[PDB]
Design a binder for this molecule. Structure first.
Ligand code: ATP
Ligand code: ATP
Lengths: 507, 507
């Protein structure tokens, strides 16, 4: 009973752990996912694989739940954490044949995790905020498995210039709002960096100007038209010449309503609903930008950038509830028509537009930008950049072997197993090639046996061995520490189960 | 085809390799062997196990043939060699999963064997011929799995005093003739060391003396009686009074024949055949020892000890074909009657008699004496006594790990595997106990990580760890080097087979 239900839980986890094994290197194979209706999709990363997966077995759920909590942190060390956890489980499964029972292995892993975390903090350097040439290599190496055939130089010079705006001034809080729009076009790969406001909404009546200098943005909500809500106090009619007079008065009231806004100092009208065609001419004889259908996601970016308040009615508008803009234009680019408002006041956030050919290419960039800025915000606030490319694990493996010699007991085999399991990263990064096999792992192991030589690792774009800091791979340390912590926490939630029962009571 | 016939040859060898695994330690279990007729025997060693074994499979024959050639050398490193070979095969079977094919492993083993042989010659000391207290510990530790409940002190003081006779004078050639007789008795365990000649033959006529001082041994073969062979030249008869006269003359000729031997200087008569009862009185009136039925194995020890020649006839005896003795006696000890001739001339060989209770105890000593002198003759001629008890393998394992770091390539995994396979001796010597398990191997591994500390090993008569040279375990180095050579030669005769065919032609 103790050994029957224990091996099944490990066998059920090793199947889902080795699924994202091939999707780890920069030049690895993709995954084809089909559905019952007939939706064939292609996924190259490992985050989407863990979501759309048959979680019918209880063992194939806790690991995914743990990985989802770690992916929402930095979003980079998700697949490697699952690979390390699977390697640890496979290494610990063989150690159960000596009849020692799972207990000392957990203590050994807990003792080795602290040593690894202490050693990782001593193999890094100090990166200040006055650098610039160092902050671009991390952005260049962040886009490898997504699509290096078009994103390797153009997408590495516009992210650093866009993020470095409020992070260098305040190195603590830099929570921005970055929105990526999924739209196609006709070009190969075009990247636009809008330094203003982007509105994704067209019109139907092209009878309004689209070039106003130093215009002012005025945010107006509802309660503007004649009928939009309801009225509890009902009215009555007496003479037929009174209703027509009231209608004419309510129609002419719009003239003075627009004149008041013009005299207050505003030339841009942003309404939540739609603007009637009869209210356009009144906005054309005065030079006021007419717009309609403003999404809340696009409207919330106007109060913190231009500087204006909202009006719940129509008679609550004065002079302090106005903003300031630069140039509002409506160009037809990439098929659809979008509104560009340039020169605001406080350039906090930024907008990035990607134009490709079909429809699956732009989406491929949608999962690449969010994973490219996340490695930047954790760089200025920290600065403990280590040597990426599978060099930290090999360096820690040479130290754990000599550190485990100072202790005596059955806990040394656990530390040795944890140290040997760290060599799975170079084996997976070299399996995608053909001229690597196993000689690369032997050559990179005896190279770090001297005094120095630490930045050397492995690159799949050459074949030989060289330094990683001189090429352009500078993976941070947080993405490794969080991955190691997740792997050490997930490997203990399965060995401490042993038996499994069932019940008919909810919760 | 290449991987189908290869795994079967290893699986057929691993079954016969792990059979003598339990029969290695001093306090291990025995083996019960049955036959078709119904012969149930008990064997504690591993040499007899390899002989009486079903060799119906071709893989289970070459290893036995190789072990038989090594057992005839010193007769001590036979079971351990098979254990090391099986461990090497089991370790190399797992390495074939990476698809490297057997080739570099053989080169790695050949490179590691030379390094091990060079390191073994540097961890020994110098033992001269003037020692005495050191030469008894090797004889005491040679009898452990045979029967330490009666052989641990009495059998450790009579072997050194018997071997040290012609070895200290000539330290090169010491080929002697040691014969062990299998006879029972009534005592618990008695050991007699005869410093002369022992004859295992009784009589039927107890009418001859058995106490003659400074007697002389005269070796006489056949051609003594009246009729023993044949005659081609036939004779005839003429008068009846002639045949009786010839018979009387031939009968009286024996009187002068014995008188001539008495005048020549001889009192002991050793004949190959039997002596008639009528020829006894003629040997009683002169004081001559009468004996009959002398085996060739007991007769060949008279020409090199007493110093006498043989006579093919009867008239070829003069005075130079005589020997010299001391005291010839015929005592009835342990049931049977044996002849003891003490005080010879050149005490070259020696005779050892073991008296037990039943019939299987004495035989248990028969397989213990030959394995106790063989470790002595190789001690004076060599003198490279190392620390026994499973301490040389652990010492070489710590050196091979650091020696394999100086090379690069796929040959390092073979050296590492060969080094890790050497740790099977302490695991087998500690498996027979209960309070050992695996902690002993971990404790004896980190103890040799300092500068000195080399004589420490493992003893099954205490439980803790201490030095082996101070207890009484001094296993020589030749029994280890020959075992390592046999294990390295036997592991290459199976991996170089791959495919196997058949034919109908003899040879
Ligand atoms: N040129 C390179 N040389 C060495 N290693 C590289 C190189 N490019 C990328 N890598 C490695 O690839 C890894 C990233 O792989 P990829 O972006 O394909 O998926 P991932 O981001 O690991 O997926 P997840 O975020 O789900 O873990 C990094 O950890 C990095 O070490
Ligand atoms: N007190 C002891 N402490 C440690 N090791 C011991 C002790 N006594 C014996 N041994 C080990 O036991 C081994 C001998 O075992 P045993 O005599 O039972 O069979 P064997 O002679 O090895 O059989 P074979 O001659 O077929 O190999 C020696 O190699 C020695 O190292």
């Amino acid at each position: 009973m103790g050994r029957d239900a224990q091996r099944m839980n490990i066998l059920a986890g090793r199947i889902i752990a080795e699924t994202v094994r091939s999707t780890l290197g920069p030049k690895g194979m993709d995954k084809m996912l089909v559905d019952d209706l007939g939706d064939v999709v292609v996924t190259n990363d490992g985050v989407t694989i863990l979501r759309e997966m048959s979680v019918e077995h209880p063992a194939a759920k806790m690991l995914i739940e743990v990985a989802k909590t770690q992916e929402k942190e930095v979003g980079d060390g998700t697949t490697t954490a699952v690979v390390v956890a699977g390697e640890l489980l496979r290494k610990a499964e063989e150690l159960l044949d000596q009849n020692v029972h799972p207990t000392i292995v957990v203590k050994g892993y807990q003792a080795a995790a602290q040593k690894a975390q202490e050693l990782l903090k001593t193999i890094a350097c100090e990166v200040g905020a006055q650098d610039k040439e160092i902050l671009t290599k991390i952005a260049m190496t962040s886009i490898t498995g997504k699509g290096a055939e078009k994103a390797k130089e153009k997408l590495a010079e516009i992210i650093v210039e866009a993020v470095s705006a409020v992070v260098d001034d305040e190195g603590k809080v830099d929570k921005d709002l970055i929105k990526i729009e999924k739209k196609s076009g006709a070009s190969i790969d075009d990247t636009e960096l809008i330094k203003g406001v982007l509105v994704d909404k067209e019109r139907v009546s092209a009878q309004m100007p689209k070039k106003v200098t130093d215009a002012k943005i005025a945010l107006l909500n509802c309660a503007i038209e004649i009928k939009e809500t309801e009225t509890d106090a009902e009215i009555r009619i007496t003479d037929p010449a009174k209703l027509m007079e009231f209608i004419e008065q309510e129609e002419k009231m719009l003239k003075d309503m627009v004149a008041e806004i013009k005299a207050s100092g505003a030339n841009v009208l942003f309404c939540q609903k739609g603007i009637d065609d009869l209210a356009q001419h009144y906005l054309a004889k005065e030079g006021i930008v007419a717009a309609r259908r403003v999404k809340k996601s696009d409207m919330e970016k106007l109060a913190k950038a231009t500087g204006a308040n909202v009006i719940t009615n129509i008679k609550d508008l004065s002079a302090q509830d106005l903003g300031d803009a630069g140039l509002v234009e409506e160009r037809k680019i990439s098929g659809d028509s979008m509104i560009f408002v340039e020169e605001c006041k406080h350039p906090k956030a930024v907008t990035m537009l990607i134009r490709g050919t079909t429809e699956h290419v732009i989406e491929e960039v949608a999962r690449a930008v969010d994973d490219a800025v996340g490695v930047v915000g954790c760089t200025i606030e920290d600065g403990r950049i280590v040597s990426g490319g599978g060099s930290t694990e090999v360096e820690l493996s040479m130290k754990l072997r000599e550190y485990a010699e100072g202790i005596s007991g059955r806990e040394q085999l656990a530390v040795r197993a944890f140290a040997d399991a760290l060599e799975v990263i170079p084996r997976t990064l070299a399996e995608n090639a053909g001229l690597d096999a196993i000689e690369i792992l032997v050559k990179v192991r005896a190279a770090h046996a001297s005094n120095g030589n630490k930045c050397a690792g492995l690159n799949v774009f050459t074949g030989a061995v060289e330094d990683m800091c001189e090429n352009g791979v500078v993976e941070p340390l947080r993405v490794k520490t969080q991955a190691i912590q997740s792997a050490a926490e997930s490997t203990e939630m399965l060995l401490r189960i042993d038996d499994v029962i069932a019940a008919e009571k909810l919760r």
